[PDB]
Amino acid sequence: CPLMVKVLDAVRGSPAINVAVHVFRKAADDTWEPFASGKTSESGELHGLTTEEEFVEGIYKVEIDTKSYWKALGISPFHEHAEVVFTANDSGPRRYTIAALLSPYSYSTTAVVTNP
Amino acid sequence: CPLMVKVLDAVRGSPAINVAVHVFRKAADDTWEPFASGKTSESGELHGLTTEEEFVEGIYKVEIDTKSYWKALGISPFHEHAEVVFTANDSGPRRYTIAALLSPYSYSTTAVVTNP
Amino acid sequence: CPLMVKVLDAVRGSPAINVAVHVFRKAADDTWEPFASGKTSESGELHGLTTEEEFVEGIYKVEIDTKSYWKALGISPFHEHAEVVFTANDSGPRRYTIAALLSPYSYSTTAVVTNP
Amino acid sequence: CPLMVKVLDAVRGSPAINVAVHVFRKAADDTWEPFASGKTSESGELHGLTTEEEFVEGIYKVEIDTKSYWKALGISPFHEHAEVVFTANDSGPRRYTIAALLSPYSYSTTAVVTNP
Ligand SMILES: COc1cc(C(=O)c2ccc(C)cc2C)cc([N+](=O)O)c1O
Ligand SMILES: COc1cc(C(=O)c2ccc(C)cc2C)cc([N+](=O)O)c1O
């Protein structure tokens, strides 16, 4: 609910289906602690990662396993993964969508942050 | 149903709301004929542009009125509009989403084409 | 010199070489008048389109022939071209670089505008 | 020379000047070892990070300090940095250009890889 990830494929013109996504939260010692993870659905979307209670302010990293995605399609990739690192700030009610558009040698990412 | 447009704002991190979108189909004389149009909703989406019966194969242009969008936000823009020109090809059942991510001096667009 | 175009290939991670580019300028009767054209070099760059004298104020359209590029690589892409439409030199001469990043179902474009 | 970084600003339509960039290389114990760092110039480019001798095969992370860039412009952005993680030189030396296009809530990155 508070955090959704959506992944699209710029080569095939499709959702990026069955992509592994890991979310980490930065710990006090500056290490990355696993927070949530899953695989994108047939729509390219990954829902249900966290809850309002669990998602507190902090620094988060979303790692999208793009290399494995491209390899499963038989397409030669450049990156190991796509990484999105951001701060969650409580500024009234907010829902976050982290969206990524994947190509073999490029990616784009945006945040769509809305007030429900 | 067969054609949806979605527009996002990379500066504000939001859907691009109330953006005018025009769709044209290329005529035999190479001119662009108005085909459908509307304004994006609060989700950034524009549904209901056309019907399965009306949307035939051909060359289409989607013009997204980005300059007016940025001006309404008080942000100085570069482009007059964003233009997406593509061929619709009947290759089994297909639904098209034309998505765009807007910045003042840049835009990105992709097509998400799925079989319902 | 005042107008340069650069095109990159997001599948191969390379310059997009031998891409045709056509520049138009909106005429007083609202038609698109041919202005300049050329092909990208081995670096993906297209220099020498115009001159300071010829590049007057106006609304310009840069059409990048992405479909012909993909077809030459044996790929059937989604878009016919990538189009960049902008007002130029409205506050005196500027140098414009129009850059594009290509995938079969997506493109991104940015402008870099500098004052000499 | 073998590794160059270029950063552009999609709000202003300009090179992103004075952007800090830190490159790491994955060590045999799976930690990220510092490798090279620098700042983009007035053209948005960062040359001279490394040498052919030092740039061995490995997994590299290029961290572009986008938050510090935006904060210096008086903007509160979404991301902490932009991260580009890739295996380099796996089939012999290549020249890599890592390019990034920045907005407050989005970034795009591409790689241009050439064989000398
Ligand atoms: C089809 O549906 C969607 C598509 C897209 C995108 O195509 C998109 C994704 C990332 C980037 C950096 C840029 C683009 C244009 C995002 C969406 N979303 O809701 O953010 C979305 O729903
Ligand atoms: C003006 O000069 C350059 C521009 C650009 C880009 O505009 C570009 C950058 C990132 C992305 C994701 C997409 C785009 C189109 C890249 C360059 N390069 O060498 O990669 C370059 O030289």
mmCIF file of N, CA, C and O in Angstrom, chain B residues 26 32 59-61 67 78-88 96 98 105-113, chain C residues 32 59-61 63 67 77-87 96 98 105-113:
data_model
loop_
_atom_site.group_PDB
_atom_site.id
_atom_site.type_symbol
_atom_site.label_atom_id
_atom_site.label_comp_id
_atom_site.label_asym_id
_atom_site.label_seq_id
_atom_site.Cartn_x
_atom_site.Cartn_y
_atom_site.Cartn_z
ATOM 1 N N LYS B 26 -2.900 9.417 -39.552
ATOM 2 C CA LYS B 26 -2.356 9.895 -40.818
ATOM 3 C C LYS B 26 -3.308 9.559 -41.938
ATOM 4 O O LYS B 26 -3.737 8.412 -42.060
ATOM 5 N N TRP B 32 -2.387 15.032 -41.012
ATOM 6 C CA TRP B 32 -2.798 14.471 -39.738
ATOM 7 C C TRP B 32 -4.249 14.826 -39.461
ATOM 8 O O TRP B 32 -4.589 16.004 -39.351
ATOM 9 N N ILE B 59 -1.027 4.814 -39.004
ATOM 10 C CA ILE B 59 -0.019 5.595 -38.334
ATOM 11 C C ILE B 59 -0.718 6.658 -37.511
ATOM 12 O O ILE B 59 -1.568 7.403 -38.028
ATOM 13 N N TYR B 60 -0.376 6.726 -36.236
ATOM 14 C CA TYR B 60 -1.008 7.635 -35.285
ATOM 15 C C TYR B 60 0.045 8.538 -34.687
ATOM 16 O O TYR B 60 1.203 8.170 -34.548
ATOM 17 N N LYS B 61 -0.384 9.734 -34.320
ATOM 18 C CA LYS B 61 0.414 10.695 -33.592
ATOM 19 C C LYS B 61 -0.330 11.070 -32.326
ATOM 20 O O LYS B 61 -1.492 11.474 -32.379
ATOM 21 N N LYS B 67 3.929 22.106 -22.919
ATOM 22 C CA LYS B 67 4.243 23.496 -22.627
ATOM 23 C C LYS B 67 3.167 24.107 -21.749
ATOM 24 O O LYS B 67 3.471 24.808 -20.771
ATOM 25 N N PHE B 78 10.950 23.790 -22.258
ATOM 26 C CA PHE B 78 11.652 23.831 -23.515
ATOM 27 C C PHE B 78 10.767 23.489 -24.711
ATOM 28 O O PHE B 78 10.781 24.187 -25.719
ATOM 29 N N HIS B 79 10.080 22.370 -24.657
ATOM 30 C CA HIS B 79 9.375 21.861 -25.808
ATOM 31 C C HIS B 79 8.023 22.539 -25.983
ATOM 32 O O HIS B 79 7.394 22.974 -25.023
ATOM 33 N N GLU B 80 7.557 22.571 -27.225
ATOM 34 C CA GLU B 80 6.169 22.964 -27.483
ATOM 35 C C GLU B 80 5.202 21.880 -27.014
ATOM 36 O O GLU B 80 4.154 22.158 -26.453
ATOM 37 N N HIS B 81 5.532 20.645 -27.284
ATOM 38 C CA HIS B 81 4.699 19.508 -26.974
ATOM 39 C C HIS B 81 5.610 18.313 -27.046
ATOM 40 O O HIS B 81 6.746 18.411 -27.479
ATOM 41 N N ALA B 82 5.108 17.186 -26.611
ATOM 42 C CA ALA B 82 5.777 15.925 -26.827
ATOM 43 C C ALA B 82 4.950 15.201 -27.859
ATOM 44 O O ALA B 82 3.751 15.139 -27.747
ATOM 45 N N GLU B 83 5.603 14.605 -28.823
ATOM 46 C CA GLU B 83 4.935 13.930 -29.925
ATOM 47 C C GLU B 83 5.369 12.478 -29.980
ATOM 48 O O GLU B 83 6.563 12.168 -29.919
ATOM 49 N N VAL B 84 4.382 11.601 -30.086
ATOM 50 C CA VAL B 84 4.650 10.164 -30.185
ATOM 51 C C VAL B 84 3.992 9.655 -31.427
ATOM 52 O O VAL B 84 2.770 9.649 -31.504
ATOM 53 N N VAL B 85 4.789 9.174 -32.373
ATOM 54 C CA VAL B 85 4.276 8.779 -33.682
ATOM 55 C C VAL B 85 4.574 7.309 -33.885
ATOM 56 O O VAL B 85 5.723 6.891 -33.780
ATOM 57 N N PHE B 86 3.556 6.514 -34.174
ATOM 58 C CA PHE B 86 3.733 5.073 -34.188
ATOM 59 C C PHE B 86 2.769 4.419 -35.135
ATOM 60 O O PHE B 86 1.787 4.994 -35.536
ATOM 61 N N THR B 87 3.078 3.177 -35.485
ATOM 62 C CA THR B 87 2.150 2.384 -36.257
ATOM 63 C C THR B 87 1.419 1.390 -35.376
ATOM 64 O O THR B 87 2.023 0.690 -34.551
ATOM 65 N N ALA B 88 0.112 1.367 -35.544
ATOM 66 C CA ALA B 88 -0.726 0.343 -34.949
ATOM 67 C C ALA B 88 -0.794 -0.819 -35.910
ATOM 68 O O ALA B 88 -1.204 -0.647 -37.047
ATOM 69 N N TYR B 96 -2.914 -0.784 -26.184
ATOM 70 C CA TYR B 96 -1.754 0.094 -26.216
ATOM 71 C C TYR B 96 -1.846 1.114 -25.091
ATOM 72 O O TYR B 96 -2.832 1.844 -24.996
ATOM 73 N N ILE B 98 0.402 4.421 -24.121
ATOM 74 C CA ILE B 98 1.469 5.348 -24.444
ATOM 75 C C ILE B 98 1.753 6.132 -23.176
ATOM 76 O O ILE B 98 0.865 6.830 -22.681
ATOM 77 N N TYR B 105 13.105 20.197 -19.738
ATOM 78 C CA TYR B 105 13.976 20.164 -20.910
ATOM 79 C C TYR B 105 14.137 18.756 -21.455
ATOM 80 O O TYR B 105 14.979 18.549 -22.293
ATOM 81 N N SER B 106 13.310 17.803 -21.040
ATOM 82 C CA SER B 106 13.487 16.421 -21.470
ATOM 83 C C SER B 106 12.155 15.704 -21.354
ATOM 84 O O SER B 106 11.337 16.025 -20.509
ATOM 85 N N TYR B 107 11.962 14.698 -22.171
ATOM 86 C CA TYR B 107 10.894 13.759 -21.920
ATOM 87 C C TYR B 107 11.308 12.375 -22.389
ATOM 88 O O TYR B 107 12.138 12.206 -23.258
ATOM 89 N N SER B 108 10.643 11.412 -21.829
ATOM 90 C CA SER B 108 10.797 9.996 -22.155
ATOM 91 C C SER B 108 9.422 9.449 -22.491
ATOM 92 O O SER B 108 8.429 9.828 -21.862
ATOM 93 N N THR B 109 9.344 8.528 -23.441
ATOM 94 C CA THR B 109 8.094 7.898 -23.742
ATOM 95 C C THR B 109 8.335 6.427 -24.028
ATOM 96 O O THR B 109 9.379 6.048 -24.567
ATOM 97 N N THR B 110 7.354 5.617 -23.667
ATOM 98 C CA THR B 110 7.386 4.191 -23.972
ATOM 99 C C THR B 110 5.997 3.753 -24.365
ATOM 100 O O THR B 110 5.003 4.421 -24.114
ATOM 101 N N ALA B 111 5.955 2.597 -24.997
ATOM 102 C CA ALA B 111 4.720 1.924 -25.328
ATOM 103 C C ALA B 111 4.661 0.631 -24.551
ATOM 104 O O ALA B 111 5.625 -0.122 -24.481
ATOM 105 N N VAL B 112 3.518 0.377 -23.949
ATOM 106 C CA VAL B 112 3.235 -0.870 -23.226
ATOM 107 C C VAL B 112 2.095 -1.504 -23.993
ATOM 108 O O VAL B 112 0.978 -0.972 -23.997
ATOM 109 N N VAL B 113 2.372 -2.603 -24.703
ATOM 110 C CA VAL B 113 1.410 -3.234 -25.604
ATOM 111 C C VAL B 113 1.188 -4.627 -25.089
ATOM 112 O O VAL B 113 2.128 -5.426 -25.047
ATOM 113 N N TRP C 32 5.136 23.222 -42.004
ATOM 114 C CA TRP C 32 6.498 22.896 -41.625
ATOM 115 C C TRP C 32 7.409 23.011 -42.837
ATOM 116 O O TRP C 32 7.378 22.148 -43.718
ATOM 117 N N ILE C 59 9.828 28.274 -34.462
ATOM 118 C CA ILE C 59 9.470 26.976 -33.912
ATOM 119 C C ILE C 59 10.052 25.910 -34.830
ATOM 120 O O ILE C 59 9.773 25.916 -36.030
ATOM 121 N N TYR C 60 10.868 25.040 -34.279
ATOM 122 C CA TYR C 60 11.600 24.028 -35.022
ATOM 123 C C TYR C 60 11.118 22.652 -34.594
ATOM 124 O O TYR C 60 10.734 22.418 -33.465
ATOM 125 N N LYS C 61 11.162 21.748 -35.563
ATOM 126 C CA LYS C 61 10.874 20.339 -35.342
ATOM 127 C C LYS C 61 12.072 19.550 -35.822
ATOM 128 O O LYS C 61 12.430 19.609 -36.999
ATOM 129 N N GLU C 63 13.105 15.845 -36.506
ATOM 130 C CA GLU C 63 12.545 14.510 -36.707
ATOM 131 C C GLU C 63 13.729 13.564 -36.875
ATOM 132 O O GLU C 63 14.510 13.700 -37.811
ATOM 133 N N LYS C 67 12.747 4.669 -37.049
ATOM 134 C CA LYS C 67 12.262 3.421 -37.640
ATOM 135 C C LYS C 67 13.256 2.930 -38.692
ATOM 136 O O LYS C 67 13.566 1.732 -38.738
ATOM 137 N N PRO C 77 10.476 -1.721 -35.036
ATOM 138 C CA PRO C 77 10.271 -0.929 -33.820
ATOM 139 C C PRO C 77 8.861 -0.375 -33.806
ATOM 140 O O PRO C 77 8.094 -0.464 -34.761
ATOM 141 N N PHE C 78 8.552 0.246 -32.686
ATOM 142 C CA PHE C 78 7.209 0.782 -32.469
ATOM 143 C C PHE C 78 6.993 2.143 -33.143
ATOM 144 O O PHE C 78 5.969 2.394 -33.793
ATOM 145 N N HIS C 79 7.932 3.067 -32.935
ATOM 146 C CA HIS C 79 7.736 4.447 -33.366
ATOM 147 C C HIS C 79 8.165 4.623 -34.810
ATOM 148 O O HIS C 79 9.086 3.958 -35.307
ATOM 149 N N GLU C 80 7.540 5.590 -35.462
ATOM 150 C CA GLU C 80 7.962 5.979 -36.795
ATOM 151 C C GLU C 80 9.221 6.832 -36.728
ATOM 152 O O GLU C 80 10.132 6.704 -37.549
ATOM 153 N N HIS C 81 9.235 7.790 -35.814
ATOM 154 C CA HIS C 81 10.362 8.672 -35.617
ATOM 155 C C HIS C 81 10.346 9.117 -34.168
ATOM 156 O O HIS C 81 9.462 8.751 -33.385
ATOM 157 N N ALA C 82 11.312 9.914 -33.823
ATOM 158 C CA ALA C 82 11.290 10.629 -32.559
ATOM 159 C C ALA C 82 11.226 12.093 -32.950
ATOM 160 O O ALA C 82 11.978 12.491 -33.831
ATOM 161 N N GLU C 83 10.316 12.868 -32.364
ATOM 162 C CA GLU C 83 10.126 14.264 -32.747
ATOM 163 C C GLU C 83 10.405 15.190 -31.582
ATOM 164 O O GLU C 83 9.946 14.948 -30.461
ATOM 165 N N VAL C 84 11.141 16.259 -31.854
ATOM 166 C CA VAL C 84 11.485 17.231 -30.821
ATOM 167 C C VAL C 84 11.068 18.569 -31.387
ATOM 168 O O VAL C 84 11.639 19.032 -32.387
ATOM 169 N N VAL C 85 10.097 19.216 -30.740
ATOM 170 C CA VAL C 85 9.519 20.460 -31.237
ATOM 171 C C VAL C 85 9.741 21.537 -30.173
ATOM 172 O O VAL C 85 9.354 21.352 -29.016
ATOM 173 N N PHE C 86 10.337 22.657 -30.554
ATOM 174 C CA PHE C 86 10.738 23.685 -29.598
ATOM 175 C C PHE C 86 10.857 25.032 -30.282
ATOM 176 O O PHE C 86 11.151 25.114 -31.465
ATOM 177 N N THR C 87 10.644 26.087 -29.513
ATOM 178 C CA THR C 87 10.974 27.430 -29.948
ATOM 179 C C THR C 87 12.459 27.706 -29.671
ATOM 180 O O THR C 87 12.966 27.431 -28.574
ATOM 181 N N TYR C 96 22.176 24.823 -29.219
ATOM 182 C CA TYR C 96 21.278 23.756 -28.840
ATOM 183 C C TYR C 96 21.881 22.405 -29.197
ATOM 184 O O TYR C 96 22.269 22.171 -30.345
ATOM 185 N N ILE C 98 20.388 18.632 -29.164
ATOM 186 C CA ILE C 98 19.224 17.773 -29.030
ATOM 187 C C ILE C 98 19.740 16.339 -29.011
ATOM 188 O O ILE C 98 20.340 15.887 -29.976
ATOM 189 N N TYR C 105 10.871 0.153 -28.386
ATOM 190 C CA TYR C 105 9.554 0.597 -27.981
ATOM 191 C C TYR C 105 9.585 1.878 -27.165
ATOM 192 O O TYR C 105 8.558 2.239 -26.596
ATOM 193 N N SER C 106 10.688 2.607 -27.147
ATOM 194 C CA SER C 106 10.807 3.788 -26.292
ATOM 195 C C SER C 106 11.870 4.715 -26.816
ATOM 196 O O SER C 106 12.840 4.274 -27.420
ATOM 197 N N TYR C 107 11.724 6.004 -26.517
ATOM 198 C CA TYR C 107 12.868 6.892 -26.664
ATOM 199 C C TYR C 107 12.789 7.964 -25.596
ATOM 200 O O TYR C 107 11.739 8.242 -25.037
ATOM 201 N N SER C 108 13.960 8.516 -25.316
ATOM 202 C CA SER C 108 14.105 9.661 -24.454
ATOM 203 C C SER C 108 14.834 10.751 -25.212
ATOM 204 O O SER C 108 15.713 10.476 -26.006
ATOM 205 N N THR C 109 14.520 12.006 -24.892
ATOM 206 C CA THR C 109 15.195 13.121 -25.513
ATOM 207 C C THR C 109 15.428 14.195 -24.481
ATOM 208 O O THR C 109 14.621 14.396 -23.575
ATOM 209 N N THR C 110 16.563 14.885 -24.627
ATOM 210 C CA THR C 110 16.849 16.042 -23.792
ATOM 211 C C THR C 110 17.434 17.135 -24.662
ATOM 212 O O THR C 110 17.915 16.912 -25.763
ATOM 213 N N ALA C 111 17.382 18.348 -24.124
ATOM 214 C CA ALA C 111 18.006 19.478 -24.751
ATOM 215 C C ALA C 111 19.027 20.075 -23.804
ATOM 216 O O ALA C 111 18.751 20.268 -22.610
ATOM 217 N N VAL C 112 20.189 20.409 -24.326
ATOM 218 C CA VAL C 112 21.206 21.175 -23.631
ATOM 219 C C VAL C 112 21.348 22.490 -24.382
ATOM 220 O O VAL C 112 21.676 22.490 -25.572
ATOM 221 N N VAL C 113 21.078 23.603 -23.696
ATOM 222 C CA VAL C 113 21.014 24.911 -24.307
ATOM 223 C C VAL C 113 22.020 25.781 -23.594
ATOM 224 O O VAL C 113 21.966 25.933 -22.371
#
